[PDB]
Structures are given as structure tokens and as C-alpha cells.
Design a protein around this ligand. Structure first.
Ligand SMILES: Cc1cn([C@H]2C[C@H](O)[C@@H](COP(=O)(O)OP(=O)(O)OP(=O)(O)O)O2)c(=O)[nH]c1=O
Ligand SMILES: [Mg+2]
Ligand SMILES: [Mg+2]
Length: 342
DNA sequence: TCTAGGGTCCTAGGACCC
DNA sequence: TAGGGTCCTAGGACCC
């Protein structure tokens, strides 16, 4: 009763698209991210920049100290979305069991697949080859019996490569697998896990479920399961977006409500335009605002509201600005909408 | 170096219902 | 009849 799960993951996705579309960027360090003056971070970088230590989520001022010649790009999100549509149509030639996780990646359940003699290894190879032939972009893949192992496996032969984990190989693979490599175990959890002497799935195997349940709640059960290779999550091809958000970080902090209002006036049309693509009548469940301060504390207030409304968002931002802000500079204003359920 | 913007999921207290 | 459900809401870890 073993499933065959493929995780497919595009290599340096945004940057790979910019190199295809402008070959002059192929061999110099490049990154998509906001400028240092715009107070940006790196979205992603190519391998020449990664050589200097440039990473996703790194503040752009840090990226340039590490890599002074870094060529900074703004991002062409329609070009990326077009590549995403194409690779997802390529996935559909092999199975309809496709769960996209983002523009550039998806789980595939190929258990019931007729292609390539039921070899998930060969299906993954053929998808990567087709992606390259039709889009001139490379992808990596991971093949495993469950989601999270397949997703770990796609990172291990990057770029332009794959890795297969059989059920026979799972116990040896788990024994030394760092917990931080498990999707959903981030910095905060890994440091809390490290402080009680838990670093690897091997360590957690030597643990009692009851203790993990008391110390981490439902997260403790997931830790216990993952450390054994247990991941029963099904590939779900029916997920739908639940929210729409539009926010901006200013080059300089703002200190006057007139400035905040001015920002919202620019944000609102963008939010209405993106909402209208999915809900033309603009009917919603909740709408709300977000402020982020000088000191990086962040607050949101949102409420039941039936239809996108600019003045109510302005009013809500006014309350949050007056009430909870105490003469701090504001670095970010955001608008937010929660979509109706169905 | 100085910290984005797109999101998902979980948690928790009080309101509210019974 | 002392407590059991289920929304509302804010915050925060985490993902790409
Ligand atoms: C991780 C991350 C990705 N992204 C964007 C840019 C990435 O190219 C795109 C896909 O994310 P990832 O697949 O996580 O990163 P990647 O494709 O650039 O690198 P890799 O070759 O290691 O898979 O999502 C961000 O904007 N911010 C982030 O923090
Ligand atoms: Mg990728
Ligand atoms: Mg990815």
C-alpha cells in the first residue's frame, strides 16, 4: 500500500526566468529583490550570487555587502505566472493528482499512473526533461512514498537533478535527518527542539508521544509522526485561495496620518483589481488593515464586512493609527480581505 | 545588514448558544 | 447548572 509521490521544484525560479529572457544575466550574480533604498529583501538569486552567500529573505543591504556587483532586478510576475501555468499543464499530461504549493512547485501523486511503466523515477525525469525542452528552464524533483520526504528529496540533487527514496531507504534516511529539514519546523521550533537535546528524527524517535503532545500540542504529534516517516497527507488538487492582501513598505518611515492615508489611496485600487479577478462583485467575508512600526511590531485589525470598501479601510487604519502606535514611525501599510468560504 | 510581499495554518480568550 | 459547543478576532510561526 505504498504511494508514489513526486515533488517538482523549479531551480532558482524567478532568476532562472530572467536569465532565459536576458542571457546577459546568465553568468553574473543577479537577484530579484527590492533596492537597499527601498529597504528590500532578496526574493531569490542565481548561482553566481549564491556563491557569495546571497540567499532568499536576506536584506538587500546584506546581499550587496556580500556581493557588491549584485545585479538587482524588480521581478516580472506575469512572466513567472506564465511559466507556472505551463509546467502545471505539463504535470497534467501525467496525472490529474496535482497539488501546487506555489508558482514554481507541486506534489504529484503518480501511484495510479500508466506512464513510464509505473516508474515514478522515470516520470519525474520525463517531466524535468519536458519542462526544459518547452520552457528552457530546469527543475529538480524528489520521489518518495509520502509528501514531506519527496519535498526533502527534491532539494538534494538541485539544480537540475532528482533523488528517489524507497521505503527500504526511509529508516536510514530518517536516522540522521535534521528536524529543521522537515517542512513546518522553522528556526524558532528547531531552536526549542535543540534546547531539549532534539536535533534529528533519530532523536525524536527516542521520544514519548505523550511528552511531545504536552510540550508542543498538535505540532508535537506531527513531529513524532514525521520522525518515523509517517505522513498520511493526501495530494489534494482542490485547494482554493482564502485571502487577498496588498501591503507596501515605504523607503522612509511615516509619522503623519496624512501620509498613511495617501498610501492607502494607492493600495486600494490594486486590492480591488486583484479581488475583482476572482470575485467580480467584490463580495467578501472580512476586510482589514495592517500597520508595521519602527520597532518591527505589527498589528492587524479586520472585521466582518460584506463588500470591499475603501472608506471603511481608511477609517479602520485611522483607529489603529491613533490607538496603537505611540509616536513610532510606521514602515508598512497593508490592506487585507478574507474571501467568502465556498 | 537591517530586515518584502504573496500567502497558509494554528492557537487562544471571550462572546454567544444550550 | 456547570459545563459543553462554535464564531470572532489578533498574533505569530512558517512557507514560497
Ligand atoms: C523562499 C522564497 C522564495 N521566493 C520566490 C522566489 C523564488 O524563485 C520562488 C520559488 O521559491 P523556492 O523554490 O523556495 O526558491 P528558488 O526556486 O528560487 O530556489 P531553488 O532552486 O532552491 O528551489 O519563490 C520569495 O519571493 N521569497 C522567499 O523567501
Ligand atoms: Mg524552487
Ligand atoms: Mg519552490
Amino acid at each position: 500500500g505504498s504511494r508514489k509521490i513526486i515533488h517538482v521544484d523549479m531551480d532558482c525560479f524567478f532568476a532562472a526566468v530572467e536569465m532565459r529572457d536576458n542571457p546577459a544575466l546568465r553568468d553574473i550574480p543577479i537577484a530579484i529583490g527590492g533596492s537597499r533604498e527601498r529597504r528590500g529583501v532578496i526574493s531569490t538569486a542565481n548561482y553566481p550570487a549564491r556563491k557569495f552567500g546571497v540567499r532568499s529573505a536576506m536584506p538587500t543591504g546584506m546581499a550587496l555587502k556580500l556581493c557588491p556587483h549584485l545585479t538587482l532586478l524588480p521581478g516580472r510576475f506575469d512572466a513567472y505566472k506564465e511559466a507556472s501555468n505551463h509546467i502545471r499543464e505539463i504535470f497534467s499530461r501525467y496525472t490529474s493528482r496535482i497539488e501546487p504549493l506555489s508558482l514554481d512547485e507541486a506534489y504529484l501523486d503518480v501511484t495510479d499512473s500508466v506512464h513510464c511503466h509505473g516508474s515514478a523515477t522515470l516520470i519525474a525525469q520525463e517531466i524535468r526533461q519536458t519542462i526544459f525542452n518547452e520552457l528552457q528552464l530546469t527543475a529538480s524533483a524528489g520521489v518518495a512514498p509520502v509528501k514531506f520526504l519527496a519535498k526533502i528529496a527534491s532539494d538534494m540533487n538541485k539544480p537540475n537533478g532528482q533523488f528517489v527514496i524507497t521505503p527500504a531507504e526511509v529508516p536510514a534516511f530518517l536516522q540522521t535527518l535534521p528536524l529543521a529539514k522537515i517542512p513546518g519546523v522553522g528556526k524558532v521550533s528547531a531552536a526549542k527542539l535543540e534546547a531539549m537535546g532534539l536535533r534529528t528524527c533519530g532523536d525524536v524517535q527516542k521520544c514519548d508521544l505523550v511528552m511531545l503532545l504536552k510540550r508542543f500540542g498538535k505540532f508535537g504529534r506531527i513531529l513524532w509522526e514525521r520522525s518515523q516517516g509517517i505522513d498520511e497527507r493526501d495530494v489534494n488538487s482542490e485547494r482554493l485561495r482564502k485571502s487577498v492582501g496588498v501591503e507596501r513598505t515605504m523607503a522612509e518611515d511615516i509619522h503623519h496620518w496624512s501620509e498613511c492615508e495617501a498610501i492607502i489611496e494607492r493600495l486600494y485600487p490594486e486590492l480591488e483589481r486583484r479581488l475583482a479577478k476572482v470575485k467580480p462583485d467584490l463580495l467578501i467575508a472580512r476586510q482589514g488593515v495592517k500597520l508595521k512600526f519602527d520597532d518591527f511590531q505589527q498589528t492587524t485589525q479586520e472585521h466582518v464586512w460584506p463588500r470591499l470598501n475603501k472608506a471603511d479601510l481608511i477609517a479602520t487604519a485611522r483607529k489603529t493609527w491613533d490607538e496603537r502606535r505611540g509616536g513610532r514611525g510606521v514602515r508598512l501599510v497593508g490592506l487585507h480581505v478574507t474571501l467568502l468560504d465556498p
